[PDB]
Design a protein around this nucleic acid. Structure first.
Lengths: 398, 178, 552, 178
DNA sequence: GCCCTTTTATAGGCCGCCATGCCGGGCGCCCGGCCG
DNA sequence: CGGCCGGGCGCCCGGCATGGCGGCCTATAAAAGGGC
DNA sequence: GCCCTTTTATAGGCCGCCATGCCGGGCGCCCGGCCG
DNA sequence: CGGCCGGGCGCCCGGCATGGCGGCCTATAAAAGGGC
């Protein structure tokens, strides 16, 4: 609750680096720029956070002050003409200084977030349920998003899984539903597991399976944390998960019962409509969660298989992609029922000449089914062999 | 070398060699305005070639706005005729062009800061006060205002060849900085 | 409304190429004369194949695909009609006339670019084939301007007016009578860009309105157009003349009796209803605003329902109506509706926060919906997604502060008609009146700064004056301007005018002087924080007991 | 200053002080290969820490592939033990690290051409032959290969502090060029 | 300082506005309980 | 188990009048001739 | 030259392939005509 | 006006064998120790 300390002794190296860069800016480039002595008082020799550091020790705030206010003042103090000679190196030094300040501030933010997350885990562990849970959930979700350390991320995942159960037993449900929605949101951030619809909205009748560096790591670590949280949540709740928490049900199901009986909003094809992304975000959760659900919820996924198969026959390419993935998973885990559905209501459609969507989805489902099941696909190769033999010589290239 | 400047303003001075009663000019000519508190001259205008004349009590006038030397001289002659028709014995004498302004647009942006740093002896740049780099050239005595958009305006010339020479002299420098 | 929304190098190339092609096409048409539609078919295919395609409700899904070339080919085809029609021979005027039924449907389409191109093309066609195109406009575009649910219909039908004025210029004089009422109505429309372009169109049209009474009739007007001009003349004649008609009522057998002042009030409401203008029925409490409101709402619903049997257009849809009241008055509203207007059906979205899902979809199925200010506020994120015919606020004064969240909530209600019931439209500051009219007629009194500078600052500065022209005149002119501006949209009627039995009310002030102890305490406090504590302390120490003792 | 290098290879030489019959090592150890035509040593390998040993007939060996000094020394000791088990009286003597290689990735691209032009005395750049700038440093004797991607690998060091000093020395230069 | 003409064009200060309050006073909502 | 419960607190009320962002608006810059 | 390890990474030459033909010989198409 | 017209020429046939782009593939670069 109380504001965090302005500094830590571990970041004295960062602050000292900032001090050295600022001193370079003040000294070397004004010697180059020919500004007389007395340009600025010397930076404090002792950096904040060190032992026996006085209250006037050098801090990041002094770095900001020198890189903005003293920079402007010194520029105004430079003689005309010499300013033109000196200014570009001053700009380079200023940008470098700002970069070091940003690095130090980011390190401080990371340490504060980690400490807050650990404290929140301690508070939830001893069964505290504050009447006003504003900061606790914020800290825990921050440690689910931006936690590079796997162990602490798993600990925060368990923390959320226990917090949801405690709130369900308490009866209050606002924050519970909010965090469940946020978990389902974070689970779908990774591009490789659920693509950005605004990019693929313009592609039709193409096999998706055949087709900035910093953000790639952030997306996958966030998705890792969310997936572990959801798995522990399901293991905790057991059979009753489909009864206790309905917000997950709405997220998973509302685009599935929508678009039924051939229904198709025109905005579903609109790149600027958020529902085109929300559809795939919804359909990712089935794959993300079904293998870890209880067998008591196998009837739920079985009853929803008629929706997934129709998504596999749908003319929307991403519908077929996600339906192939989800059918592969369902046939992996709910084996007999899913494979009955596949052999009885997918493989017959593989030979349709006019319905290119039918063949495309019904071959991509086989691709992903083999890839996920591996050795378990032995008893069903007799079903799968003839369609692939026929479609090796199909008209469509992919 | 490349493209050629386009002239935008020419200022000429001509002496009519006779005293003029300015308020009598103002009260008779529709195209004349007189405000002795603001300025000491009558501002006459004609629409072919589009030019303005600051006609003074001492007989001098300054004709501005012309896009060519022939147009400026013809406008000065027309203004002398107009003063003649109002009764004054004005005579066209002492014509001399005294300023030519030009403008050109080279097709690339300019790194003003590097140019100012390298050529600090002959340039001034205060971007807080004026976005254009000022450049003063010693040989043809032309002053160039350089802008990041790739547009240069030359001023202070008394002949067309002066702005042409100034543009030829400055073009390699602008090529060097993007 | 998309009309409101190295590159510099290519911009010149595009326009010079289009200039050359257009001149070539014009000379080609003049060469061929009447026979151009016979000798050259490929031009016909280019112009026409996306016009018969996508017609009769047709819509390929690839028409909305950014990577499908046909989405560009459609507009490329539709540009040629504008590019070429003014230079064609009169023998081809029948061709464009026969294709007008396709371009009008292109104007009604939900595709924005379709509406843009159709507005442009109809403007051109009405410029050149004037009588037939304007017959099509008045008969099959302007009737659709009032459709509540069909936003595309209104949007296209206002953009066509925009471009028609912009292209025809002075030639639009005989036809301003048809276009004046739609733009007047749509200046106060729920949608922002319709309001903006309607404002521009009205700025152009009102200057020409005084001339419309005597423009010579164009020679070729069809009988439908003469009848339209006559009926529009009779329609406008009541607006621009103090004379008025007997009020609008539906004489149902179970309908209640109306008093005289209630008769005048329903007359005023009907006058507002005809021309699509909004007001505040700011009567004193105890005069029965509920009867007048339900009377006009029921009469409008009855009229629309009856017209839906005489026609088949989507103008009427049996749309719902909304009423927002404080919780205590919902029972009174329902009792009055049931006893005075039985044939209406009522719904009460006043349930518990979970209960409301039991009637979430019932909002679109009942004639009158009743809700509370706070129930609407907490659930505005779902209530905004419904359209309404009438939107009544029973206690306006709740929404006087613009920053209050109830105002932000209520101002998102897209409604065809909009009315505030109140007793004190202005209580402390004219900005309260501005906040109310921002809900009723957005933009009518300008933005916040505009209204501030126009009225509010002079009104505040007039608080301390001694008949001095420095500030007295400013305040006087401000109140006069605000009075004239909002005159037709308020209807105040005093309780003294109506009630035949209410004794007079007398007022007297009782003056006294402060006691010695309190006086000394205040004199000490003068030497002695925040500004408000001083006022609160003065209020406290001000505490009269002898005055009350003697008065009782 | 900023980020720190990561060491990638360490090469150590240790003398076993006894002659070895290489073919007898090859015929008995599964993890040894001997090809006298190609190279004069047996290439032994062990899987903890992952290292390779070129063991020669003269008793010297070269142990490579380690990521740390302790790992290199422990691997050399294990190889000496393995030679002892095969019957030879090998004794761990004359250990000395003789090369350390490091790698780092500063987070911005580098303008190699300007760097080569300014620091021509200490660098070489032939982009037709090798896509990396070569930089030779005299004080710590470290050689740096600088790449446009922002990745620098240091080599020739005999201590960790040498590559640390070399990175500290070179980092301002890389900051100057983007 | 004052004015005329011309092509170029953008960022500091100056006058405003504008949300800040903070004590009682009330209403309405949902959020926790329990009662026969 | 159904139904009324108190219960908290967010929202709005209202005053004066101070301080911190504002957008917008010359002024900025260049040549030159003349007269005041 | 020869080899081991390690992180970095991309552009010249070398061996291929690959479309080039161009004289008669024929078929099929559409593109110009006219015939009773 | 309807129907068969000749009429041209683009397309494909086939041979051997030469010259000009190819992709791809080491080689390029750095340190160092050992022995041959």
């Amino acid at each position: 609750d109380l504001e965090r300390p302005s500094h830590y002794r571990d970041l004295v190296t960062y602050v000292q680096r900032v001090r050295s860069a600022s001193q370079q800016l003040i000294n070397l480039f004004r010697d180059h720029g020919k500004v007389s002595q007395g340009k600025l008082p010397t930076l404090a020799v002792v950096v904040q956070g060190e032992p026996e550091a006085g209250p006037g020790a050098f801090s990041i705030a002094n770095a900001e002050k020198v890189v903005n206010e003293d920079f402007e003042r010194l520029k105004r103090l430079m003689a005309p003409g010499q300013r033109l000679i000196a200014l570009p190196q001053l700009n380079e030094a200023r940008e470098q200084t700002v970069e070091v300040i940003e690095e130090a501030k980011a390190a401080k933010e990371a340490r504060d977030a980690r400490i807050k997350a650990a404290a929140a885990c301690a508070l939830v562990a001893m069964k505290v349920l504050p009447k006003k849970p504003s900061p606790l959930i914020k800290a825990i979700m921050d440690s689910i998003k931006t936690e590079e350390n796997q162990e602490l991320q798993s600990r925060s995942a368990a923390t959320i899984a226990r917090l949801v159960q405690l709130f369900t037993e308490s009866g209050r449900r606002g924050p519970a539903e909010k965090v469940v929605a946020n978990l389902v949101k974070f689970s779908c951030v990774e591009v490789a597991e659920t693509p950005e619809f605004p990019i693929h909205a313009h592609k039709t009748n193409v096999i998706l399976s055949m087709q900035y560096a910093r953000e790639a790591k952030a997306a996958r670590i966030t998705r890792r944390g969310a997936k572990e949280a959801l798995e522990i949540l399901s293991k905790n709740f057991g059979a009753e998960l489909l009864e206790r928490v309905p917000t997950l049900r709405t997220f998973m199901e509302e685009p599935l019962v929508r678009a039924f009986s051939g229904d198709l909003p025109p905005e579903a094809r609109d790149p600027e409509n958020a529902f085109g992304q929300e559809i795939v975000d919804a359909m990712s959760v089935i794959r993300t969660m079904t293998p870890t659900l209880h067998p008591a919820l196998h009837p739920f996924v079985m009853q929803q298989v008629p929706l997934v198969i129709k998504a596999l026959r749908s003319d929307l390419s991403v519908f077929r992609y996600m339906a192939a993935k989800c059918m592969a998973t369902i046939c992996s885990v709910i084996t007999v029922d899913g494979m009955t559905a596949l052999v009885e209501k997918v493989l017959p459609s593989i030979n349709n000449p006019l319905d290119l969507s039918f063949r495309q989805g019904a071959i991509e489902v086989i691709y992903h089914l083999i890839a996920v099941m591996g050795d378990a696909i032995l008893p069903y190769v007799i079903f799968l062999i003839v369609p692939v033999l026929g479609r090796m010589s199909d008209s469509d290239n992919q | 070398s490349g493209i050629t400047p386009t002239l935008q303003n020419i200022v000429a001075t001509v002496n009519l060699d006779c005293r003029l009663d300015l308020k009598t000019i103002a009260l008779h000519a529709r195209n004349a305005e007189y405000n002795p508190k603001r300025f000491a001259a009558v501002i006459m205008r004609i629409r072919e070639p589009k030019t303005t004349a600051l006609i003074f009590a001492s007989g001098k006038m300054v004709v501005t706005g012309a896009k060519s030397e022939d147009d400026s001289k013809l406008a000065s002659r027309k203004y002398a005729r107009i003063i003649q028709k109002l009764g004054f014995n004005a005579k066209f004498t002492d014509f001399k062009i005294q300023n030519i302004v030009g403008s050109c647009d080279i097709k690339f942006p300019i790194r003003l800061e590097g140019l100012a740093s390298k050529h600090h002896n002959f340039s001034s740049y205060e971007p807080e006060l004026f976005p254009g780099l000022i450049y003063r050239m010693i040989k043809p005595k032309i002053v160039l205002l350089i802008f990041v958009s790739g547009k240069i305006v030359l001023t202070g010339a008394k002949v067309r060849e002066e702005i042409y020479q100034a543009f030829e002299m400055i073009y390699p420098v602008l090529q060097d900085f993007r | 409304i998309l009309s409101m929304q190295k590159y510099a190098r290519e911009a010149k190339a595009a326009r010079i190429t289009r200039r050359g092609a257009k001149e070539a096409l014009e000379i080609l048409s003049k060469n061929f004369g009447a026979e151009l539609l016979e000798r050259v078919p490929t031009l016909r295919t280019f112009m026409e194949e996306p016009l018969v395609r996508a017609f009769s409700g047709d819509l390929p899904p690839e028409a909305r695909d950014p990577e499908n070339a046909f989405g560009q080919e459609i507009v490329d085809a539709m540009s040629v009609i504008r590019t070429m029609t003014p230079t064609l021979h009169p023998a081809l005027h029948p061709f464009v006339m026969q294709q007008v039924p396709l371009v009008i449907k292109a104007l009604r389409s939900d595709l924005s670019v379709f509406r843009y191109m159709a507005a442009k093309c109809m403007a051109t066609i009405c410029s050149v084939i004037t009588v037939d195109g304007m017959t099509a406009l008045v008969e099959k575009v302007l009737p659709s301007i009032n459709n509540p649910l069909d936003l595309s219909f209104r949007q296209g039908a206002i953009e066509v007016i925009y471009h028609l004025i912009a292209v025809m210029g002075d030639a639009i004089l005989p036809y301003v009578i048809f276009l004046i009422v739609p733009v007047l109505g749509r200046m106060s429309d729920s949608d922002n860009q319709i309001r903006l372009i309607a404002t521009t169109s009205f700025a152009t049209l009102v200057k020409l309105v005084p001339l419309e009474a005597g423009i010579p009739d164009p020679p070729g007007l069809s009988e439908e157009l003469l009848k339209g001009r006559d009926r529009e003349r009779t329609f406008i004649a009541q607006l621009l003349d103090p004379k008025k008609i007997e009020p609008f009522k539906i004489p149902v057998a179970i309908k209640a009796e109306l008093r005289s002042y209630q008769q005048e009030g329903v007359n005023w409401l009907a006058f507002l209803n005809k021309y699509h203008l909004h007001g505040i029925l700011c009567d004193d409490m105890g005069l029965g605003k509920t009867l007048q409101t339900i009377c006009i709402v029921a009469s409008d619903h009855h009229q629309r329902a009856e017209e839906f049997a005489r026609t088949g257009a989507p103008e009427v849809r049996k749309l719902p109506s909304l009423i927002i009241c404080p919780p205590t008055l919902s029972g009174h509203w329902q009792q009055e509706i049931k006893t005075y207007a039985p044939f209406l059906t009522v719904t009460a979205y006043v349930g518990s926060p979970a209960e409301r899902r039991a009637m979430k979809d019932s909002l679109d199925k009942t004639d009158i919906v009743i809700t509370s200010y706070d129930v609407c506020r907490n659930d505005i994120d779902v209530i905004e997604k419904y359209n309404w015919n009438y939107c009544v606020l029973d206690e306006g004064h709740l929404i006087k502060n613009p920053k209050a969240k109830i105002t932000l909530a209520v101002k998102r209600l897209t409604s065809n008609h909009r009315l505030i019931l109140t007793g004190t439209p202005i209580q402390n500051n004219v900005l309260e009146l501005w906040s109310l009219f921002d809900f009723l007629m957005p933009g009518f009194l300008g933005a916040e700064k505009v209204f501030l500078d126009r009225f509010a600052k002079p009104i505040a500065n007039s608080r301390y004056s001694k008949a001095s022209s420095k500030e007295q005149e400013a305040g006087a002119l401000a109140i006069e301007a605000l009075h004239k501006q909002v005159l037709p949209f308020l209807l105040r009627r005093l309780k003294e005018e109506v009630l035949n039995d209410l004794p007079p009310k007398i007022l007297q002030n009782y003056y006294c002087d402060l006691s010695d102890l309190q006086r000394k305490l205040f004199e000490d406090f003068t030497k002695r924080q925040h500004i408000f504590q001083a006022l609160q302390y003065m209020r406290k120490l001000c505490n009269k007991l002898g005055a009350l003792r003697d008065l009782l």
